[PDB]
Amino acid sequence: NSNICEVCNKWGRLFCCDTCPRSFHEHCHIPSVEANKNPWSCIFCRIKTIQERCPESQSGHQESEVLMRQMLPEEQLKCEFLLLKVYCDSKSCFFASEPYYNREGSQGPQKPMWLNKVKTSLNEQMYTRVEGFVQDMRLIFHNHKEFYREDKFTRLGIQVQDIFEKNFRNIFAIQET
Numbered sequence: 526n527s528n529i530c531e532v533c534n535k536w537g538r539l540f541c542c543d544t545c546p547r548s549f550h551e552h553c554h555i556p557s558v559e560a561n562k563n564p565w566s567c568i569f570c571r572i573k574t575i576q577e578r579c580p581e582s583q584s585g586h587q588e589s590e591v592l593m594r595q596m597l598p599e600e601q602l603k604c605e606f607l608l609l610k611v612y613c614d615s616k617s618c619f620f621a622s623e624p625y626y627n628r629e630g631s632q633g634p635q636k637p638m639w640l641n642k643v644k645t646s647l648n649e650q651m652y653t654r655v656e657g658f659v660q661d662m663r664l665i666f667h668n669h670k671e672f673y674r675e676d677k678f679t680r681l682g683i684q685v686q687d688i689f690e691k692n693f694r695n696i697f698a699i700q701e702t
């Protein structure tokens with residue numbers, strides 16, 4: 526197995542996948558690494574198995590159909606994996622914890638949103654459709670771009686949103702256009 530966490534790229538107390546070489550800090554994996562389980566397979570492996578069991582799941586889909594899906598276990602897992610792929614980018618640090626807004630010439634967003642809040646909402650089964658999760662993720666970046674205006678720091682939101690959108694299209698097999 527790898528000697529660093531797949532998500533944050535640091536060493537520490539690591540839990541090793543039994544079916545691939547990846548390793549994870551307990552709370553960097555999503556869902557958090559399960560207490561007792563041998564063998565244990567990581568979320569990458571679990572997502573791959575869904576693909577293998579149903580190869581046609583990789584055929585192109587319409588975004589509007591994906592968003593309307595209820596959060597059954599496979600969709601729950603795909604949203605957990607999509608969230609994890611955002612945390613895998615080191616620029617996710619800017620979006621992880623609860624933000625605050627005090628900048629001359631700007632007003633904070635009406636509905637603040639951040640990755641750890643989305644992580645909690647998934648863990649608590651608060652989303653009934655894919656749409657709820659995707660709307661909260663897009664809101665994180667939209668709030669950032671509106672607040673920072675012409676400050677070049679706006680670009681961090683564009684960059685992390687692009688990682689989110691590329692992973693969304695791949696994980697949910699959105700039809701290429």
Ligand SMILES: CO[C@]1(C)Oc2ccc(N)cc2O[C@@]1(C)OC
Pocket residue numbers: 569572573610691692695696
């Ligand atoms: C959809 O393909 C999977 C399940 O997820 C990915 C998501 C983003 C990117 N970039 C690549 C991915 O490759 C796979 C095979 O995981 C390793």
Ligand SMILES: [Zn+2]
Pocket residue numbers: 530531532533534535549550553
């Ligand atoms: Zn980690």
Ligand SMILES: [Zn+2]
Pocket residue numbers: 542543544545546547566567568569570
């Ligand atoms: Zn694995």
